[PDB]
Write a protein that binds this ligand. Structure first.
Ligand SMILES: [Zn+2]
Lengths: 97, 63, 132, 88, 27, 69, 277
RNA sequence: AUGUCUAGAGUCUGAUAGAGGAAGUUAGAAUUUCUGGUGUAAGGGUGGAAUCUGUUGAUAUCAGAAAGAAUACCGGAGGCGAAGGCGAACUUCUGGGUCAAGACUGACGCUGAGUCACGAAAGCGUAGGGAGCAAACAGGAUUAGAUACCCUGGUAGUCUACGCUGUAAACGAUGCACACUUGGUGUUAACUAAAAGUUAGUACCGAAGCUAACGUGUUAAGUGUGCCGCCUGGGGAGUAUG
């Protein structure tokens, strides 16, 4: 079942590593069959509790579509990216409609 | 007196600077009876605050 | 659903409405309910009853009767026969309810009839209810 | 899950027409599909007990419908059990 | 309730359990 | 982590009055006195039961006194 | 995996259980070009004395040439051909067929199946069965068959059902929690295999009778209090003594708690925190 | 015995609330232990003390590492589930409920002896794990005595996977279902833009009625019935025996 997922990712501070990490994330979704990938940069904020020794990082929102069964596997692969500090994947909002 | 009902926008962790007003000055959630919000909005607001705290958008305790 | 009484449901509704002192009560509709309310009407226990409509379903609206002092005409109305306990009686062994002050209602070969009519026509059957 | 497409598909197969959801054959077929994928789910998640209760309620509903159908329309009942595989 | 009856039941239960504990491990 | 920055010209007295007030408004001391030692969930629930009953009786009491007067 | 139990039709079968070999590509004979017949050992050495006691004549078995050192086959994918029973060790052995035509045996991990493709080297994906230097394996994975010196092969954990936990990495070394439970430093350039070793019911077995213990090549064990004082420090059992002496080995070495590791060994630098009792 | 109907009950459609369940991942606070600095004679504990801990460097304080268990604030005159019960975050799998002209089937229902499934905590078997807490147990106190209350320690257990046990003041001390019978004050969800009302819940007070009384009172313990379970003075006794 194709499901409209929406996810948030945190990357470490410097720009080149941010961009590279985001690139393998994007190719990762494409390999796992994601469709309608759209991003939205949130900025570069100072974290208010340190994560993996870092104190400052850049936030990304990705709103894609993808079938259910590959979430398991996709997740199992997102642990390999060195520069992805934290993230969460959510089903769509409870929109007022 | 539910601010989310008044503004017509619904709680969301991405909108974290707005979330910061329903938090005490070091992270604790405010009660309904104080902030005067509706029950459904309060439940969604608590869930979103927890999500943000998981993303370090919001603090567990200020340091 | 286990209604278990097209008879006792109307009897209970009529009893409740009567003691709280309503003006009318609004019952489900069936041939036996019509027959019973007809007998009530001849016996002067209820004023009248009408046939109605709601959402395509037929109802019976009954006009409760009271004295001028709001004392109900019906004092006690209660079933005798019952799905777990069916009570039949010959036309000789018919009980006279409250020395005749009340009336007994039965279901017999010739229809739903009062006890006096059953005695006068020498027929007996199931004892539906007693009213006084 | 039984998706809307197979739901309507089974309705179309088993009912007299496209709008005949409420007939007994459609009822039994849909409940049988639910039972099958639930026994699959509960084969894996053996410590799931709410789901087992739901499955048992479904089985009871199917037995009730089967008795009513067999009493009322007998030959349709035998055709139905033979087609659906429900042993007797 | 007065609770005396509950106390009676309690002491009865204790004595019965003590009997069973005593006769455990015996054979 | 409750803080009260003391200004250069600000007085110590009101400084720790502010500290005391915002401590009480974080309820740190009550939380610590609550977590001193364990309580059965049963007895938490029962004490809340009884506290609410006391509050209701006291309110009914207060309104009775108000109308009695 | 699984355990198969027996009905008690004899007084010996009452507590006999064996493994069930369902997770094994059965009906199998070993690859003729990799197995050689061999004696049974029984613990005697070149001089002919008994150096280890209580080892005797079990079932005759062939030797299967295993390969714990996959280094000279980096970057070359191979196919899993079969999963076979090995009498010389607890774990099962997988037969890999390499793309260049060479076939080899490896320890069969937990959860691989026939037809899988396996790869070794720095570039290999992180997948159960692949062999990579400890550099490349991410912290938090479970590996097995750890190499101790580059070019030596897997000399660490190898037995059925075991795995090691990677904890941290630093300088030239990686901290690894071994199955005994100690935390040891490993040189980062050695290779390891990803994932646990299959066949984890091997030690849940109840042997059942003295005969099977004899099949496994284990002669009977004679206690020390059944001896005479000429035979063993504990002897002298005129009516069931308990040794009359603090417990010792047959050669006078204490046995209840005595620590026999050398006090100034060379590898002491690489042991962080020893195992626990 | 054979038909007919739709208002009961279901299926389909749409909307919607929810700590419902199972599996797989992740998080921080706090505590304990270990290592490395600063630093000195107490720490800890009680009604009052002592045991204990500490000059082998305590407690306190800073930094780092590791493990386990539990999820403050939200959080309550809440929510869900048949009950037990379920509260950090996410995904996957999955159960149930509620509303409506919004069509379909046409009584397909209620209850249910045996039987089956689930069933807090404690306990048992196998294999792990073990921070904190803590039966048994040890020491120090109180006391005539203290096999306890108090203090310092501390093994099972508490935790995980699988297989058993099937007991609780397992309570609303009130079996389930349906048809009816004035109101007041809050609250949850939905319909309505929202009020305002309705429907389905969930609490307090209360008229009539009922009750031995306490109390109950549209979530009856009121007026009626269907079916099941159970009671017939107390002790002996939930014992003896099977
Ligand atoms: Zn709002």
């Amino acid at each position: 079942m194709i499901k409209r997922y929406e996810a948030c990712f945190l990357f470490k501070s410097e720009e080149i590593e941010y961009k590279g990490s985001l690139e393998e994330v994007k190719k990762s979704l494409e390999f796992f069959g994601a469709t309608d990938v759209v991003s939205n940069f949130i900025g570069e904020r100072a974290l208010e509790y340190p994560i993996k020794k870092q104190a400052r990082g850049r936030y990304e929102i990705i709103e894609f579509s993808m079938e259910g069964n590959n979430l398991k596997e996709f997740e199992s692969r997102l642990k390999l990216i060195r520069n992805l500090l934290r993230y969460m994947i959510l089903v769509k909002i409870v929109r007022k409609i | 007196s539910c601010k989310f009902c008044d503004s017509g926008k619904h709680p969301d962790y991405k909108d974290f600077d707005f979330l910061k007003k329903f938090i005490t000055e070091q992270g604790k959630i405010l009660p309904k009876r104080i902030t005067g919000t509706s029950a459904k909005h309060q439940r969604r607001l608590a869930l979103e605050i927890k999500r943000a705290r998981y993303m370090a958008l919001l603090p567990f305790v200020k340091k | 659903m286990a209604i278990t009484y097209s008879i006792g449901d109307m009897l209970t509704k009529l009893r409740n409405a009567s003691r709280v002192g309503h003006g009318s009560v609004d019952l489900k509709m069936s041939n036996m309910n019509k027959s019973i309310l007809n007998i009530l009407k001849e016996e002067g226990y209820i004023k009248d009853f009408n046939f109605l409509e709601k959402k395509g379903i037929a109802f019976i609206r009954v006009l409760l009767k009271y004295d001028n002092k709001r004392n109900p005409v019906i004092n006690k109305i209660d079933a005798i026969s019952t799905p777990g306990r069916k009570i039949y009686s010959s036309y000789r062994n018919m009980p006279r309810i409250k020395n005749g002050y009340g009336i007994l209602i039965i279901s017999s070969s010739q229809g739903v009839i009062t006890g006096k009519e059953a005695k006068d026509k020498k027929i007996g059957g199931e004892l539906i209810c007693s009213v006084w | 899950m039984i998706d809307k497409k197979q739901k309507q598909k089974i309705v179309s197969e088993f009912g007299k027409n496209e709008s005949d959801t409420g007939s007994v054959g459609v009822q039994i077929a849909l409940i049988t599909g639910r039972i099958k994928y639930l026994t699959e789910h509960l084969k894996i998640n053996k410590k799931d007990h709410s789901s087992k209760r739901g499955l048992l309620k479904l089985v009871g509903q199917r037995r009730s419908l089967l008795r009513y159908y067999q009493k009322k329309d007998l030959e349709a009942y035998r055709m139905l059990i033979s087609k659906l595989g429900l042993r007797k | 309730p007065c609770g005396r009856k509950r106390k009676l039941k309690k002491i009865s239960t204790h004595k019965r359990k003590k009997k069973r504990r005593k006769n455990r491990h015996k054979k | 982590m409750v803080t009260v920055t003391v200004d250069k010209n600000e007085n110590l007295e009101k400084a720790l009055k502010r500290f005391k007030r915002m401590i009480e408004k974080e309820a740190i001391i009550r939380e610590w006195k609550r977590r001193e030692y364990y309580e059965k969930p049963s007895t938490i629930r029962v004490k809340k039961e009884k506290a609410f009953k006391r509050k209701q009786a006291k309110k009914v009491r207060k309104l009775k006194q108000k109308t009695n007067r | 995996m699984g355990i198969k139990t027996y009905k008690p039709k004899t007084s010996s079968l009452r507590y006999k259980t064996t493994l069930s070999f369902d997770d094994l590509s059965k009906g199998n004979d070993p690859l003729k070009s990799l197995t050689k017949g061999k004696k049974f050992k029984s613990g005697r050495d070149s001089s002919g004395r008994i150096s280890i006691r209580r080892r005797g004549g079990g079932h005759k078995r062939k030797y299967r040439l295993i390969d714990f050192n996959r280094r000279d086959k980096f970057s070359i994918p191979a196919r899993v051909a079969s999963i076979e029973y090995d009498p010389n060790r607890s774990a099962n052995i997988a037969l890999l067929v390499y793309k260049d035509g060479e076939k080899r045996y490896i320890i069969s991990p937990k959860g691989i199946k026939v037809g899988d493709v396996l790869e070794s080297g720095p570039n290999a994906p992180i997948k159960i069965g692949n062999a990579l230097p400890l550099e490349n394996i991410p912290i938090g994975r479970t590996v097995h068959n750890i190499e101790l010196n580059v070019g030596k092969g897997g000399q660490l954990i190898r037995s059925a059902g075991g795995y090691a936990m990677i904890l941290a990495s630093d300088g030239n070394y990686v901290t690894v929690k071994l199955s005994s439970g100690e935390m040891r430093l490993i040189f980062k350039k050695c290779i390891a295999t990803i994932g646990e070793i299959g066949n984890e019911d091997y030690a849940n077995i109840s042997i059942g009778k003295a005969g099977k213990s004899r099949w496994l090549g284990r002669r009977p064990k004679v206690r020390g209090v059944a001896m005479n004082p000429v035979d063993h420090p504990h002897g002298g059992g005129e009516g069931k003594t308990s040794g009359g002496r603090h417990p010792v080995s047959p050669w006078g070495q204490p046995t209840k708690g005595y620590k026999t590791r050398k006090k100034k060994r060379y590898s002491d630098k690489f042991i962080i925190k020893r195992r626990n009792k």
